Amino acid sequence: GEVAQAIKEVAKAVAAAIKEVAWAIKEVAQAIKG
Amino acid sequence: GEVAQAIKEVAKAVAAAIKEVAWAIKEVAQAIKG
Amino acid sequence: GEVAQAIKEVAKAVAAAIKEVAWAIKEVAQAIKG
Amino acid sequence: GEVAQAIKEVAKAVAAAIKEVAWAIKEVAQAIKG
Amino acid sequence: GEVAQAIKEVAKAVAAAIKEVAWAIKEVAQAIKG
Amino acid sequence: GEVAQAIKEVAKAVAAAIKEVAWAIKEVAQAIKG
Amino acid sequence: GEVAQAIKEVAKAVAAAIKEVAWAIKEVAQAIKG
Ligand code: NA
Ligand code: NA
Question: Do B27 and A29 touch, CB atoms closer than 8 A?
Answer without folding.
Answer: no
